[PDB]
Structure 1
Amino acid sequence: RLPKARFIAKSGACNLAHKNIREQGRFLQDIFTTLVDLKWRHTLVIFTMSFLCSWLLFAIMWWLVAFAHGDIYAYMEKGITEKSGLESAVCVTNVRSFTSAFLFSIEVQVTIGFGGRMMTEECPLAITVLILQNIVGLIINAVMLGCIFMKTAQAHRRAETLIFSRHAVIAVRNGKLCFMFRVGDLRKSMIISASVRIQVVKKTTTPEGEVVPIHQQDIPVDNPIESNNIFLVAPLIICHVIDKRSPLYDISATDLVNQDLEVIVILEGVVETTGITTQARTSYIAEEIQWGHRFVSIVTEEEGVYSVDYSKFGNTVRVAAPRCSARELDEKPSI
């Protein structure tokens, strides 16, 4: 009872599955690419995690660093100043605790700098770790800043919202059959140089043995200059007539109830403000197309101005239709 595998699921999102792909690998730089495009929830945590980590790490490099040069002991043994004058060799002035060291750490990699913890010039290793901490702080700061700007740059583009009607129809226009979906639009800006292509997916044997397993023909759509452009403000009805040249030409009234057909439709174009290319895909399997009922009018001239109504986006009514095939209807006049 499983549906025979569909090439493009009804909600776009082509559901193919190719394996044995030679594992190209897992490029060392890949984490950064994954890092750039995260939910804002994460890029407001990895920020905090990176900063807090670096701070703590350099702090530990730092509380211990104060101990080694004799700093902790002078303050502790006597009074800081009442009993005695400074040893004057303190690496960073008044750096009392592995708490105080942590506090000091915040000044170097965050560029605040209070002043009560100066850097003397005796201990060279201290100068080395100062250079290193400052460089790391700058690199981390710049990388995080670039990430935050990328995820504030891409706040304009959100998502493809191009809506095809649920299922197709098949009717007669000017004494000949047709095939209709109903494309449409949602947001303010029109699409630019929007284009439409209709492909039929089928299993084609060949009179010379070859049997293309899942083979995709392209078929023309209807337009009085045979051009695939389009310009949509209210939903259109993009027909694509069937004729002797067309492949659907052998479909039948009964056979469509159990048939191997797959009419994918693709629509391309850009969006004016964002200036970004985009495309949208969808389909029509044999179960989904029901013959003889044309779609229902939308545009209504209100008193003031035209009105486009969505209440009946996919509504259908039956209409006269002959049950023969495409080649049958044109087979003979008397036919």
Structure 2
Amino acid sequence: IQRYVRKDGKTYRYLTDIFTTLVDLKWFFNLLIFVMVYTVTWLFFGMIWWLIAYIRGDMDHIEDPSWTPCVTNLNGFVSAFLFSIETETTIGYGYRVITDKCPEGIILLLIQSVLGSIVNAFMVGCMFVKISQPKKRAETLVFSTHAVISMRDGKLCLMFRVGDLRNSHIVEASIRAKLIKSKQTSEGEFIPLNQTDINVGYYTGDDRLFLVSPLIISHEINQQSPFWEISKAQLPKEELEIVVILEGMVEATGMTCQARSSYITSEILWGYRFTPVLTLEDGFYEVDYNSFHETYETSTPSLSAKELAELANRAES
């Protein structure tokens, strides 16, 4: 079995999801604003046309055929409003047509047409911006419901599982992780919240990922990491939050998708280990998503990372 060879790697769903999202969103937000923005200007132009009719007073000569009204077949407010909505939207049925005997009518038609073009351009731009975004969120790219600190290669390591559900919509990505918690400092300069970056491979470029399967991304706990002074017993009391952002993720189509999750002090487990999601066999591999979040307890020292390093130094010396 080979990953791939000189290739990318080895569509009704997307359209259906987009249609469902649009249908869900259109009930409350879209139907109100997008309709009212046209309705207000159409009503405004209706009042303007009615005011011009009143100035010309063609209702008095509505039955009179000798008079030439500004707009043919104008009888009342509803007639003017209907003429306005006809003209502005570029329909022009013809039962009512502007005559050639009033320059004010020509000026109004020009203004209405250009303003309607502007409104349509605004409509298209707003629809494009709202529906299409350079970095849209993705329902895939689920994170592990737990982050586990475990024992790896002589050093403690915090890891969380991240992967893609569709097995093809994510190949390349990047990951960043920030711990937010409050300090006190030696000078008493209390800070209600502090952000510190936990290294996940920024120096070595390991932060970039080729996601072909679920990956257990492991942070390394060293003398330059926030968790360097925490232990098993001290973890529950201290309240800290971890925010993990995965970005720069193409979908083998071209756009960029983003995802974000977090972990709380009650959501971090000590001394556990992720259950492997992939099992190999002669000629084949099998991955079962049912064990994506499954974790099993393993033996590990309960001392702090600094305490573990001190114990190792004492034993070596």
TM-score, normalising length from structure 1? 0.69
**Corresponding residue number in structure 2 for 1:51:** 38
Contact 1:167–1:284, Cα closer than 8 Å, also in 2: no
- Aligned residues of 1:264 and 1:284 also touching (Cα < 8 A): no
1:159-197 deviation digits (Å, cap 9, x = unpaired): 354322222223322333222221222243224342344
Instruction: Give unpaired runs (5+ residues) of structure 1.
Output: 1-37, 81-85
Specify which of 60, 73, 89 is matched with residue 73 of structure 1: 60
Cα gap change, 1:111/1:204 in structure 2, threshold over 3 Å: closer, same or farther? same
**Percent identity over paired residues:** 42
Q: 1:292 aligns with which of 260, 264, 271?
A: 271
1:89-238 maps to which residues of 2 (within 5 A)?
89-154=68-133, 157-159=136-138, 161-187=140-166, 188-197=168-177, 199=179, 201=181, 203=183, 205-206=185-186, 209=187, 211=189, 213=191, 214-221=193-200, 227-238=206-217
Q: Separation in 1 of the partners of 2:56 and 2:241?
A: 78
Q: Which one has the largest radius of gyration? A: 1
Instruction: Select 1:248's aligned residue among 199, 216, 227.
Output: 227
Structure 1 position 330, deviation (Å): 1.5
Which residue identity does 2:211 align to in structure 1? L
**3-state SS of paired residue (1:74):** coil
Could you report, residue by residue, the CA deviation over 1:271-304 in whole angstroms, capped at 9, with x for unpaired residues? 242522635242342x333322222121023677
Letter in 2 for 1:69: R
Q: Structure 2: how far apart are the matches of 1:129 and 1:177?
A: 76
1:70 offset after TM fit, Å? 4.6
Q: CA deviation at 1:232?
A: 1.9
- For 1:40, the equivalent position in structure 2 comes to 26
In the alignment, is the contact (CA less than 8 A) between 2:173 and 2:246 conserved in 1?
no
Provide the C-alpha distance between the structure 2 equivalents of 1:218 and 1:145, rounded to a whole number of angstroms.
41
Q: In terms of mean alpha carbon deviation, does 261-270 or 319-328 score higher? A: 261-270
Report what 1:333 is aligned to: 315
Q: Write the distance in 2 (CA, Å) between the matches of 1:266 and 1:156.
A: 13
Q: Deviations over 1:44-87 (max 9, x none)?
A: 443332333333332333345334435323343xxx6xxxxx31
* Aligned amino acid, residue 39 of structure 2: L
CA distance change for structure 1 residues 66 and 291 in 2, over 3 Å: closer, same or farther? closer
Q: Which amino acid aligns with 1:289?
A: I
Question: Aligned residue for 2:295?
Answer: 316
> Which amino acid counterpart does residue 60 of structure 1 have in structure 2?
M
Structure 2: stretches of 5+ with no match in the other structure: 1-23
Aligned mates of 1:246, 1:276 — CA distance in 2: 30
Q: How much is the aligned-residue C-alpha RMSD, in angstroms?
A: 3.6
Report the Cα distance in structure 1 between the residues aligned to 2:178 and 2:115, rounded to whole angstroms: 55
**Contact 1:160-1:278 at 8 Å conserved across structures:** no
Determine if contact 1:221/1:241 at 8 Å carries over to the other structure: yes
Partner of 2:10: none
Write the distance in 1 (CA, Å) between the matches of 2:202 and 2:53: 81
Q: Which residue of 1 aligns with 2:250?
A: 271
CA distance 1:238–1:52, shift in 2 (3 Å): closer
How much has 1:235 moved relative to structure 2? Answer: 1.6
| 294 and 222 in structure 1: CA distance in 2 versus 1, 3 angstrom threshold | farther
Question: 1:282, 1:305 → 2: CA distance?
Answer: 34
The AA in structure 1 aligned to 2:41 is S
Q: Return closer, same or farther for 1:125/1:233 CA change in 2, 3 Å cut-off.
A: same
TM-score, normalized by length of structure 2? 0.72
Return the alpha-carbon distance in structure 2 between the equivalents of residues 222 and 293 of structure 1.
22
- Kept after mapping to 1: 8 A contact 2:138/2:259: no
Aligned length: 287
Q: The residue matched to 1:230 in structure 2 has which SS?
A: strand
Displacement of 1:222: 6.6
What SS does structure 1 have at the residue aligned with 2:121?
helix
**Equivalent position SS for 1:283:** strand
Higher mean Cα deviation, 166-175 or 153-162?
153-162
C-alpha distance in 1, partners of 2:80/2:203? 79
The whole-number CA distance in structure 2 between the counterparts of 1:115 and 1:200 is 67
Asked if structure 2 preserves the Cα contact closer than 8 Å seen for 1:191 and 1:269, the reply is no
The answer to which of 156-165 and 306-315 deviates more is 156-165
Equivalent position of 1:3 in the other structure: none
